[PDB]
Structures are given as structure tokens and as C-alpha cells.
Amino acid sequence: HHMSLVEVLPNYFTLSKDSPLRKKFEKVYKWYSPAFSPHDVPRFAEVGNITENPEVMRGIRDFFVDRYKNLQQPITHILGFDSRGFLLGPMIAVELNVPFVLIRKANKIAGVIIKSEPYTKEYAAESEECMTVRFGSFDKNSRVVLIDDVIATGGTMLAGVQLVDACGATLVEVAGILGLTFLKGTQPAHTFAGGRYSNVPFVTLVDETVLSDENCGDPLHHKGSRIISCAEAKKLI
Amino acid sequence: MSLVEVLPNYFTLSKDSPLRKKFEKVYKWYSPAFSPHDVPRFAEVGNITENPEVMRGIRDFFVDRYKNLQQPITHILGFDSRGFLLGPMIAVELNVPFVLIRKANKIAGVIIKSEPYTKEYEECMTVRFGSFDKNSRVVLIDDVIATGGTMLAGVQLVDACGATLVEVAGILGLTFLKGTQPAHTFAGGRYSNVPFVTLVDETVLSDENCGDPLHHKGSRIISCAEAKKLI
Numbered sequence: 384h385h386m387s388l389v390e391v392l393p394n395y396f397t398l399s400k401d402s403p404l405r406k407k408f409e410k411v412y413k414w415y416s417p418a419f420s421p422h423d424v425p426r427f428a429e430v431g432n433i434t435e436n437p438e439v440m441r442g443i444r445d446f447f448v449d450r451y452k453n454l455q456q457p458i459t460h461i462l463g464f465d466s467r468g469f470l471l472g473p474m475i476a477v478e479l480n481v482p483f484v485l486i487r488k489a490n491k492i493a494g495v496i497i498k499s500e501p502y503t504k505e506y507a508a509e510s511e512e513c514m515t516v517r518f519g520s521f522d523k524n525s526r527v528v529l530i531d532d533v534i535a536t537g538g539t540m541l542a543g544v545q546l547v548d549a550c551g552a553t554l555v556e557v558a559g560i561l562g563l564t565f566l567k568g569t570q571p572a573h574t575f576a577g578g579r580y581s582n583v584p585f586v587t588l589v590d591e592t593v594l595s596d597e598n599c600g601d602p603l604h605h606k607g608s609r610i611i612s613c614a615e616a617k618k619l620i
Numbered sequence: 621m622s623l624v625e626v627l628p629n630y631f632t633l634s635k636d637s638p639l640r641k642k643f644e645k646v647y648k649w650y651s652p653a654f655s656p657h658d659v660p661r662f663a664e665v666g667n668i669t670e671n672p673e674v675m676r677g678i679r680d681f682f683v684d685r686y687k688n689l690q691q692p693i694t695h696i697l698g699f700d701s702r703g704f705l706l707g708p709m710i711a712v713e714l715n716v717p718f719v720l721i722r723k724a725n726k727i728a729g730v731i732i733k734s735e736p737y738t739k740e741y742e743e744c745m746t747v748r749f750g751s752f753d754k755n756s757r758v759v760l761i762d763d764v765i766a767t768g769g770t771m772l773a774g775v776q777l778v779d780a781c782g783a784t785l786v787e788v789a790g791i792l793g794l795t796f797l798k799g800t801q802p803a804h805t806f807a808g809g810r811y812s813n814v815p816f817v818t819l820v821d822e823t824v825l826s827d828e829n830c831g832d833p834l835h836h837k838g839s840r841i842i843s844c845a846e847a848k849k850l851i
């Protein structure tokens with residue numbers, strides 16, 4: 384059940400074009416235009432169509448569990464980003480028998496917490512929002528994987544790298560299910576702190592080629608706002 | 621393990637359940653000075669997710685409960701953001717969709733929005749139209765059930781599609797808040813026969829599993845530069 388990666392940019396890996404798991408993603412991943420999306424990027428890849436497909440979810444789980452089980456030196460923690468990284472990390476961490484550590488927006492986490500620098504995303508300019516992690520959840524002897532759903536500009540991953548760096552831990556790999564390689568999202572993590580993390584592979588199972596013209600999820604016709612009330616929805620039962 | 625009905629249709633693990641005993645050792649609570657929310661005892665979910673044995677116990681309990689049914693469950697619906705930590709690992713083992721119930725401006729497509737809701741500490745939940753339908757048999761899942769306002773928002777969305785609500789599931793039920801009441805009184809009591817099942821309850825929060833750092837000086841939020849001086 385092994386699936387194969389190809390290095391498409393330096394330390395940016397994605398599944399081969401012919402990979403059976405990629406073909407499964409191609410049938411389920413849909414993108415939405417600004418008219419039907421919470422953020423007006425050209426093609427918004429809704430994670431719910433992935434979580435609604437248990438076969439693809441199992442393929443994601445199996446890929447990363449097998450990958451990290453077969454390392455010569457095991458990982459000790461998986462760190463996942465609020466909110467969509469939360470959907471992917473725990474099912475991997477439970478099979479590896481490692482902690483799943485939450486990286487959360489402001490302060491959401493109780494106790495003593497470490498805050499990143501203010502982050503940016505493909506669709507978010509810098510503001511006061513930072514990512515945080517619980518102090519004491521991992522340390523300088525930890526070997527960690529950062530996981531999210533999408534890697535676009537790499538701003539979110541940079542915030543995670545800053546938090547890993549704040550504890551002196553070893554960053555083994557950055558993991559996701561969709562990498563928009565034309566945005567070169569490896570760059571922030573790979574140039575932070577004078578290149579301290581340039582040897583960290585990014586592994587995103589599929590890439591922008593999954594967001595094909597035939598994979599638009601927009602309704603072909605829809606009355607009014609995409610946001611409907613419960614009473615309006617009941618008339619469609 | 622075995623469940624005890626502590627309030628009408630509000631079930632939790634027995635006092636001697638081995639899984640309850642594991643929760644007792646792992647769960648920590650935080651006072652308002654060390655928590656993001658103004659409640660006496662805030663039960664941080666990160667201490668659960670950091671313990672793979674307890675996560676496996678949670679997953680195995682619900683997978684075992686919901687498998688091999690005469691009428692199978694068709695979908696697990698989980699709440700943004702902490703329900704997202706629990707639902708997928710169960711759904712993958714049951715081989716069913718996990719459906720996101722999300723806060724505003726989070727799901728793409730045509731979406732159904734609930735009435736405004738409140739929590740223990742305006743704002744509405746949403747679900748993608750077409751993720752489930754009147755023939756679905758669904759479980760709602762979250763980490764904590766407190767006032768039940770969040771669960772009521774989920775019930776409204778399930779009701780909006782005519783689906784069968786099979787069960788309400790969580791890991792921590794604060795029974796003194798009687799969180800069954802919003803869901804069980806909605807629409808004239810239409811869902812009053814739906815059990816709430818929360819693995820543990822407020823008795824898991826004792827004097828001895830308080831997580832407050834009793835010696836920490838200054839702000840509980842530290843910068844990366846400050847954290848590195850502690851390495």
C-alpha cells in the first residue's frame with residue numbers, strides 16, 4: 384500500500400502523477416470560486432469534501448503512519464494547526480502512539496503558552512493574530528512533525544516553525560494534504576533564522592493540479608446568498 | 621465500559637471504569653487566571669490529545685459502540701474546533717463521512733446556518749448543504765458539553781435536513797449545567813429521546829488535577845525569545 388512521492392521543488396514533495404492515492408483525491412477534492420467561498424482566493428479547496436470521504440481519510444492516515452513508522456529514528460510528537468490540521472493529526476498520532484500537540488490561535492490554550500510572531504496566510508494580511516502552543520508539551524529532545532491541510536504561502540507553517548524553534552526541538556518534516564507549489568510555501572520556513580530549517584522536507588500529498596476545471600464545487604445555479612436558514616433548508620427536504 | 625444514567629438521557633462512564641480512571645490522571649483544569657475563558661474550571665483538551673492511550677480509548681469506545689448495527693450510522697458530525705480532534709479517528713474506523721459543523725465564514729459552498737447560540741462563557745454554526753440528508757443517521761460529537769447551547773446549534777442543523785439524530789457524544793459532560801435541556805426542549809421536545817453520552821463528567825476535575833502553574837511569575841503568554849531563555 385506504499386505510495387510514492389516526487390520532489391517537485393527543493394524539499395517540496397508531492398505524490399507522483401500516477402499514484403493511486405492522488406487519483407482518489409482527484410475524484411473528491413473540489414474547489415470553490417470566491418462567490419461560494421469564505422475567502423476570495425481563485426480556487427478554495429474545502430477540506431470537508433476530504434473528511435466526508437473515509438477512503439481518502441484512511442489513505443491519508445495510512446500514508447503518514449507508514450511513513451513515520453519506517454523512520455530509522457522515530458518521531459516523538461505531531462503538532463497540528465487549529466482548525467483544519469486538527470482533522471488530520473490525531474488519527475495519525477494515535478496509531479504512532481505519540482502525543483498530538485495543539486497549535487492554536489490566540490491563546491485558546493490554557494496554562495503557560497508560547498506565542499509566535501503575527502502570522503500571514505494566502506488570504507490573511509498580518510494583524511495581531513499569532514499561533515500559540517502549550518509550554519512543556521515538547522522540548523529540545525523532541526522530534527516533531529508539523530501538520531496542516533493546505534500549505535499555500537507557508538506563513539502558517541512559519542508560525543509553527545517559530546514555536547518549534549522556541550523549544551529547541553528537532554523539526555523532522557512538514558506534512559499536509561495540498562501544497563500550492565506555485566506559491567513556494569517552503570520559502571519562509573527554509574529561510575527563517577538564516578536557514579536553520581532548510582533541510583526540513585515539506586510533504587503535501589496532492590498539489591494545485593488537483594484543482595482542475597472539472598473539479599469546481601460551485602453550484603451551477605443557486606438562488607440568492609449561499610447562506611441559507613434552517614427554515615429555508617427544510618423546504619428543500 | 622458500562623454507562624450510568626446520571627440525569628434523564630445523560631449517560632457517563634461508571635465510577636470504576638478503567639477509562640474513567642485514565643481520564644482522572646490525564647485531565648487537568650485551569651482557573652480563570654490561566655485559561656482563555658472565565659469559568660471556574662476550564663478543562664484543556666490539549667492534555668487529552670497529548671495522551672495517545674486516552675485518545676485510543678476514546679476512539680475505541682465509540683467505534684465499538686457504533687459498529688455492526690442493524691441500522692448503521694451514516695455520518696459523524698463534529699464541531700469546530702475541538703470536536704474536530706475526536707470525530708475523524710472514529711469516522712475512519714467506522715468507514716463513514718466526517719462532516720464539519722463550523723463557525724462563521726469557514727465552509728465553502730451552499731451552507732445552512734443555525735440560530736445564534738451561546739456557551740458557558742451573534743455567533744451561529746453552519747454545515748454544508750448536501751453533506752447529509754433525510755435518510756442519514758448521524759452522531760453529533762464535541763469534547764465538552766456544558767450549557768448545551770453548542771449541541772442545540774447542531775440539532776437545529778440536523779433537523780434542517782430531516783435526518784435521524786442517533787446520539788450526542790462527548791468526552792466531558794458538566795452535568796450540573798444540565799446541557800441536555802436545550803436540545804431536549806427544541807421543537808416541542810422532538811429530540812428528547814436522544815441520549816447524551818459523555819465519557820466522563822465534572823467529578824473528574826478534583827483538587828489534585830488542577831493544572832495552574834503555582835510558581836509562574838508574570839503573564840502566562842511568553843514570547844519565543846523568552847521561551848528560548850528557558851531551554
Ligand SMILES: O=P(O)(O)OC[C@H]1O[C@H](O)[C@H](O)[C@@H]1O
Nearest residue numbers: 504505534535536537538539
Ligand atoms: O499560511 P498559508 O500557507 O498561506 O495557508 C495555509 C493555511 O491557511 C488555512 O487556514 C489553511 O487551513 C492553513 O492553515
Ligand SMILES: O=P(O)(O)OC[C@H]1O[C@H](O)[C@H](O)[C@@H]1O
Nearest residue numbers: 739740765766767768769770
Ligand atoms: O455550548 P456549551 O455546551 O455551553 O459549551 C461547550 C462548547 O464550548 C467549547 O467551545 C467546547 O469545545 C464546546 O464546543
Ligand SMILES: Nc1ncnc2[nH]cnc12
Nearest residue numbers: 424426427428505533535
Ligand atoms: N486556496 C486555499 N484553499 C483552501 N484552504 C486554503 N488555505 C490557504 N489557502 C487555501
Ligand SMILES: Nc1ncnc2[nH]cnc12
Nearest residue numbers: 659661662663740764766
Ligand atoms: N469548563 C469548560 N472547560 C472546557 N471547555 C469548555 N467549554 C465550555 N465549558 C468548558
Ligand SMILES: [Mg+2]
Nearest residue numbers: 465466467488
Ligand atoms: Mg481558522
